[PDB]
Design a protein around this nucleic acid. Structure first.
Lengths: 140, 139
DNA sequence: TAAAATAGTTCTCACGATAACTATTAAA
DNA sequence: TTTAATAGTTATCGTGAGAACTATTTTA
């Protein structure tokens, strides 16, 4: 068999269903990094998150973080506000729609594990995760 | 929550493979370009159209169309209209294509061996049906 | 103060998705 | 032969990457 190809395919379909599922459940656009950042802002309302902080949370690059915050703004999930102390920093803030969505989305996450990890065991699962961990760790 | 982490671990995986391949003179082929070059090599007696690539790689119509444009630009393939069916365009490995399939097949071997080191088979075979289940679950 | 770390943007790109469109062949 | 299906392209988009570029702190 082949390991590079299969993996890529399996993710492409998985990614594609999550998009389908999430539109029907009224969390369109959040199956992905947008949803992950909305969740992070929710869980931690006390911390200032700047754009750079998003790079590190989501494990993405400069340009990717910049373009991602732009998309979230266009979608109404966030407001971007320059800092007054550090003139180069821009802060991110969940909007009202943002806050409402963080909630609908947390439900959706629950309904996912409940549906996609059916027929699988936590040992089976814990081992695949070590299968994965070591794959990872193989690239120093 | 953890399902996110999944797509992260792909982003690194995808990222390293691109570094590895360029270092090893198979640039641009860690990915669908490489997978299609292989398919053409392994089967030189089957004529393959752009649509056939949609099916081999499980991609959409436009993804396939754009992908072949990228391979042509890279030198790995030539695109030739069918003379029987004026709708169809056939794909053909170029000379550079053919040699790359070779260096790439080597790359695959090396990568596989260096990635599944310290891992058993049942562990790996169970990872499969754990993954096949997920896929099956999203049906 | 001069030089370097930092925060963000914009360029060009690879690789995925739809949807709307042109052709062309096949089917009814 | 009117209609369906098929093959490919191009539009807009989401989500990844690096590189070159501002503009602001640091810090040496």
């Amino acid at each position: 068999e082949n390991p590079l190809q299969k993996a890529r395919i399996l993710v492409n379909q998985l990614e594609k269903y999550l998009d389908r599922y999430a539109k029907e459940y009224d969390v369109e656009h959040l199956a992905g990094p947008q949803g992950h950042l909305v969740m992070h802002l929710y869980k931690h309302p006390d911390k200032d998150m700047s754009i750079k902080d998003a790079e590190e949370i989501l494990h993405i690059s400069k340009s990717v973080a910049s373009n991602l915050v732009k998309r979230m703004e266009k979608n109404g999930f966030i407001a971007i506000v320059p800092s007054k102390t550090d003139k180069r920093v821009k802060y991110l803030y969940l909007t009202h729609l943002g806050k409402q969505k963080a909630t609908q989305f947390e439900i959706f996450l629950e309904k996912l594990h409940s549906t996609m990890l059916a027929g699988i065991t936590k040992e089976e699962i814990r081992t695949t995760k070590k299968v994965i961990r070591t794959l990872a760790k193989n690239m120093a």
